[PDB]
């Protein structure tokens, strides 16, 4: 899993908004810099900027 290093507010409807410290499951990471992620903290799913998160434990 990954952790958010910054907050991120969605900029299109299918983005995922998240908070620093949130734990994320990366669901698709083959389409470019934006990854499809599922928040294990909120249960929501959407696209995220890959440079805002880092591998966690």
């Amino acid at each position: 899993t990954f952790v958010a290093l910054y907050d991120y507010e969605s900029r299109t409807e299918t983005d995922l908004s998240f908070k620093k410290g949130e734990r994320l499951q990366i669901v698709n990471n083959t389409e470019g810099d934006w990854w499809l992620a599922h928040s294990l903290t909120t249960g929501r799913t959407g696209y995220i900027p890959s440079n805002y998160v880092a591998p966690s434990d």
């Binding site: 910054y6 389409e31 470019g32 810099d33 934006w34 696209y47 900027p49 890959s50 805002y52």
Partner: peptide
């Protein structure tokens, strides 16, 4: 915060 990357290539 980091610069946001350009959006991915849209798929057709």
């Amino acid at each position: 915060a980091p610069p946001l990357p350009p959006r991915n290539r849209p798929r057709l």
